[PDB]
C-alpha cells in the first residue's frame, strides 16, 4: 500500500507508465525538470524506450518523493488531502479534519460513546508509526485530531500552506504523508551536458541509461506511454480548435517550440490561449479536443 502512498505524495494524476512497456522519452522535458560555451549534442526529440525498472523512494528529512527509472532505447483506495491552516500549525489547538474526510477515509467512530474517540495509528513513507487521537467534540460538532498532532507538526516541520495526506487501504493499515508548499552538487551547464550525453550514447548504442523523476519539481511529464505519444502526433490539430485539460482553451497556433536546438519536435508544439486568466504552449498529448 506504500506504493499508492508514493503516488499520493507525488500528485493525483501522475500515473507512471508500467514497467516493461514501451515509452516515449522526451529529452527537452527532462532538461526542463533539472532546470527548476556548451557542446551541442545531435539527439532525437523523442526516443522510444523500453521501461526497464522503476524505483520509488523518498528522502526521510525533506519527505520529498522521487523515482529512478531505467530506460533502454530500441531499434483505487480511499484517501483525503487537506492544506494546513494557521490553527493547524500554531501551538494552540489541534487539527480540523474535514467532514467528508472522516466518513470516507478515517475509520468510523463509535458515536455511542461520548465523546466518540479512537487511537489512530498511521504509517508514513518510511515505516514510522504516528499515534493520533481522533475525537468528535466542539459546538457545533466537528472532527478533530488532538494528541499526536503537536508532535507530528514539529518533527516533520510543517507550516501553513503545506498539506497532509491520509490514505486507508482495504487493509487495516492507515498511511500518512505530507506535501510541502512549492544547485549544490553540479553546475547547470554540467547537469545539462550530462542529461544530453547520457541520452545521446544511450540512443546511439541502444544501451541502458537512467534518470530521476521529481513529480513535484516536474512541470510536465517527459516519460509517457509510447502509444499516447503516437496517437497525439497522428491526430491533426488546427488553429481555433477547442480543447480541455478541468480548464478550457483554444488553439491559437501550431509551430516549433525551439526551431534552433530542437527542430521538428512536438514538445510544447501547440500554442493556446486560456479561457480564464486564473504557460501558453502545451504538447499535443496533454490536451484533449
- Tell me how crowded residue 233 is: count the other CB atoms within 10 A of its CB: 15
DSSP H stretches of helix in the chain: 2-10, 27-33, 86-89, 99-104, 149-155, 188-205, 226-234
CA 58: distance to chain centroid?
13
Instruction: Decide: is 140 part of the binding site for DNA (CB under 7 A).
Output: yes
Instruction: Decide: is 142 part of the binding site for DNA (CB under 7 A).
Output: yes
Instruction: Report what 96 binds from DNA, a copy of itself, none; CB cut-off 5-8 Å by kind.
Output: DNA
Instruction: Decide: is 181 part of the binding site for a copy of itself (CB under 8 A).
Output: no
The β-bridge partners of 133 are: 119
Count residues contacting DNA (CB under 7 A)?
A: 28
C-alpha cell at 146: 488532538
CA distance 157 to 23: 38
Instruction: Report what 128 binds from a copy of itself, DNA, none; CB cut-off 5-8 Å by kind.
Output: none
Q: Are 278 and 231 in contact (CB under 8 A)?
A: no
Nearer to DNA, 60 or 161 (CB): 161
Nearer to a copy of itself, 191 or 254 (CB): 191
- Site residues for DNA per CB under 7 A: 82, 85-88, 91-94, 96, 98-100, 115, 133, 135, 137-144, 146-147, 149-150
* Contacting residues toward a copy of itself, per CB under 8 A: 34, 37-39, 59, 64, 66, 68, 183-187, 189-195, 197-198, 201, 207-212, 214
Amino acid at each position: 500500500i506504500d506504493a499508492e502512498l508514493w503516488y499520493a505524495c507525488a500528485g493525483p494524476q501522475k500515473a507512471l507508465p508500467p514497467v516493461g512497456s514501451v515509452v516515449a522519452y522526451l529529452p527537452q522535458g527532462h532538461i526542463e525538470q533539472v532546470a527548476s560555451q556548451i557542446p551541442r549534442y545531435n539527439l532525437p526529440a523523442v526516443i522510444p524506450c523500453m521501461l526497464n525498472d522503476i524505483q520509488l523512494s523518498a528522502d526521510p528529512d525533506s519527505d520529498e518523493v522521487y523515482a529512478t527509472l531505467t530506460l533502454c532505447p530500441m531499434s483505487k483506495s480511499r484517501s483525503f488531502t487537506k492544506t494546513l491552516t494557521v490553527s493547524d500549525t500554531s501551538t494552540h489547538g489541534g487539527f480540523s479534519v474535514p467532514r467528508r474526510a472522516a466518513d470516507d477515509c478515517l475509520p468510523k467512530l463509535d458515536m455511542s460513546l461520548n465523546p466518540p474517540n479512537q487511537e489512530l495509528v498511521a504509517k508514513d513513507l518510511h515505516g514510522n508509526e504516528w499515534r493520533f487521537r481522533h475525537i468528535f467534540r466542539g459546538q457545533p460538532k466537528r472532527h478533530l485530531l488532538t494528541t499526536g498532532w503537536s508532535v507530528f507538526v514539529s518533527q516533520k516541520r510543517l507550516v501553513a500552506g503545506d498539506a497532509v495526506l491520509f490514505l486507508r487501504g482495504e487493509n487495516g493499515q492507515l498511511r500518512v504523508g505530507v506535501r510541502r508548499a512549492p544547485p549544490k552538487v553540479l553546475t547547470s551547464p554540467t547537469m545539462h551536458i550530462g542529461v544530453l550525453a547520457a541520452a545521446a550514447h544511450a540512443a546511439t548504442e541502444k544501451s541502458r541509461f537512467s534518470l530521476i523523476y521529481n513529480p513535484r519539481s516536474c512541470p510536465s511529464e517527459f516519460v509517457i506511454p509510447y502509444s499516447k505519444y503516437l496517437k497525439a502526433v497522428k491526430s491533426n490539430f488546427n488553429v481555433g480548435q477547442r480543447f480541455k485539460m478541468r480548464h478550457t482553451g483554444t488553439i491559437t497556433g501550431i509551430c516549433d517550440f525551439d526551431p534552433a536546438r530542437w527542430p521538428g519536435s512536438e514538445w510544447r508544439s501547440l500554442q493556446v490561449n486560456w479561457d480564464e486568466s486564473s504557460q501558453e504552449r502545451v504538447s499535443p498529448w496533454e490536451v484533449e479536443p
